[PDB]
Amino acid sequence: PEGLEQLEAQTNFTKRELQVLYRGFKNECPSGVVNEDTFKQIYAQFFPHGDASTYAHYLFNAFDTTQTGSVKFEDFVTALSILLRGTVHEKLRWTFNLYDINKDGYINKEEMMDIVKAIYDMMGKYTYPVLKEDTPRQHVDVFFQKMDKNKTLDEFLESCQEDDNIMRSLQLFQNVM
């Protein structure tokens, strides 16, 4: 975290951009360690539609390993690196950890209801097709269509390439920035 130690080595960013990222990071969290409470309003103000604290809460504990209760710059920049300019294989491993909420890497159909409903919570009330209580569970069933019918991380990792939507959606920000 020395600004020259965490260069392209272990953090695939150019130092010129990394300096700007740190400058913009400490400018909002001067103490250098962001708490989940700050993690909410720095994000929800991106969307002038309905609130987003629900999604940000699930983002934070995924960001914060070992339940420290707050994230330091090293882990933040590591995750930002593996996302923005990371590996396509390694991009989705964290996201599998994100979707998993029961700690151990298992799927029991309940960790997706809350996540998808939180994602659908952004639009609020001014949506063109008005949301109904069946719509989030319907989208959860749509996601259940592509998960393992047989009774998983391996099938998801092997079928993400099968669905080219994931393949050219991950590359929107991989090349840029």
Binding site: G3, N27, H49, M123, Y126
Partner: protein, 460 residues
């Protein structure tokens, strides 16, 4: 320590002191990159002002931001000078800290900005060298209580119903709910007042043979109203027993108990000389006016805020009373009338004249009485007026606090409305972009990505 790293050569000479008394291998210097101090001034910039300083001073204190290595992010290699985006005048004090070893605090600069800058450079708040600490901590506490009053977080099935009942102004509902109680407590207390006038209720014009005893009926009706109001409050309490101990609640419960206790006494064994005490408590209904005017609540907060020196008032008053009475009684115990029969009979004199009240029921007679009576009057003026300003000024300050709280609540609500308006303007801007200076484009693009990932569209 590292704060005096400029004085290593001193101790080096000091080392030569204990050479002949040494016995060992003398493990030799751990070598160095340079045995000099040619480290040049490093131009570190703050928002356009260059604050040149020496490297050794900066690494004098490691744990701060300017010390250690976390300054590399702010390094600007393409022009070879550190850059910071902070405030110059604020940063000057942090610069002075490294030079001396203790910060200061400007008399005249916002504590929020100063504190956030102080924390930005990763140095602990309490480094202040007790020269400005008396002021920095003062202003910090003032700001902390200002934001605590910013956090009144007042809210609006029955959980909201009872609060709306407690709400002073709900136009049609709460105004009626308060006016009925105010009128009824007023008529109760005025009935207790008028139940004594001769023609009203007493043998004033019946000796010849109106003495209409209906005040009992009015009292029964009123106290029924109080008890139903308090049952509503008891069902309205979020914590039934836990909120009973409140000041207003205990006033209410003691505003209703005397009537029930009197009824229980009526059909119980009659004890002579006891109903007078019960009738005395009939006047306490007037205390219920606390909810009517906030001045009573301000006075209660005053008397329970400056409750320290009130004990001193009572104690010093007892001292003065005893001291002056014990000299009054012995001063004129033997006289014609000899009104000062005893010390408890002189308490009344030394308190009717300590208060500068003045009756004439008992006055000094001997010459030795006069001097000490005048001395007592002056001492009474002094002791009585001594703790007055600590009460009235405290009361005025508390009233100003309670006015400022309302003003800032209104301002905070206006600010929140402006935040909502800005958010609506952002949504409007996104819709305009969809229908038809780069950050707005990229933000609209991200929201467009949200549109596709959740297959929903945005309409005004």
């Amino acid at each position: 320590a590292a704060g005096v790293a400029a004085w290593l050569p001193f101790a080096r000479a000091a080392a030569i002191g204990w050479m002949p008394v040494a016995s060992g291998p003398m493990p030799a210097p751990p070598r160095q990159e340079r045995k000099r101090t040619q480290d040049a001034l490093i131009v570190l910039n703050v928002s356009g002002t260059r604050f040149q300083t020496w490297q050794d001073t900066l690494e004098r204190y490691p744990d701060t931001l300017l010390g250690s290595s976390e300054r590399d992010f702010f390094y600007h290699p393409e022009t070879q000078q550190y850059f910071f985006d902070r405030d110059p005048d604020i940063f000057r004090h942090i610069l002075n800290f490294y030079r001396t070893g203790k910060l200061h605090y400007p008399r005249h600069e916002c504590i929020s900005a100063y504190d956030e800058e102080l924390a930005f450079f990763g140095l602990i708040p309490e480094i202040i060298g007790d020269c400005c600490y008396e002021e920095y901590k003062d202003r910090r506490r003032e700001n902390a209580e200002r934001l605590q009053d910013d956090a009144d977080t007042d809210t609006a099935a029955r959980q909201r119903v009872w609060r709306a009942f407690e709400n002073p102004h709900t136009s049609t509902m709460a105004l009626v709910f308060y006016y009925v109680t105010g009128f009824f407590i007023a008529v109760s207390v005025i009935a207790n007042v008028v139940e004594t006038v001769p023609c009203g209720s007493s043998p004033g014009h019946i000796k010849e043979l109106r003495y209409a005893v209906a005040f009992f009926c009015l009292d029964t009706a009123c106290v029924m109203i109080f008890t139903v109001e308090y049952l509503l409050r008891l069902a309205a309490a979020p914590s039934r027993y836990r909120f009973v101990r409140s000041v207003m609640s205990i006033i209410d419960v003691v505003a209703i108990l005397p009537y029930y206790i009197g009824l229980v006494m009526t059909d119980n064994e009659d004890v002579s000389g006891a109903f007078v005490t019960l009738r005395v408590f009939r006047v306490f209904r007037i205390f219920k006016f606390s909810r009517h005017s906030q001045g009573l609540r301000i006075l209660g907060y005053t008397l329970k805020s400056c409750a320290s020196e009130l004990g001193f008032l009572l104690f010093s008053l007892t001292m003065a009373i005893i001291i002056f009475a014990t000299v009054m009684f012995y001063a004129e115990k033997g006289s014609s009338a000899s009104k000062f029969t005893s010390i408890p009979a002189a308490f009344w004199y030394t308190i009717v004249t300590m208060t500068t009240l003045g009756y004439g029921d008992m006055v000094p007679k001997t010459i030795a009485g006069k001097i000490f009576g005048s001395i007592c009057s002056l001492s009474g003026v002094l002791v009585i007026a001594l703790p007055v300003p600590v009460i009235v000024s405290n009361f005025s300050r508390i009233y100003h606090q309670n006015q400022r709280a309302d003003k800032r609540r209104a301002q905070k609500k206006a600010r929140l409305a402006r935040i909502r308006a800005a958010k609506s303007g952002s949504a409007n801007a996104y819709m305009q972009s969809k229908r038809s200076s780069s950050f707005e484009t990229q933000h609209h693009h991200l929201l467009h990505c949200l549109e596709k990932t959740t297959n929903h569209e945005f309409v005004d």
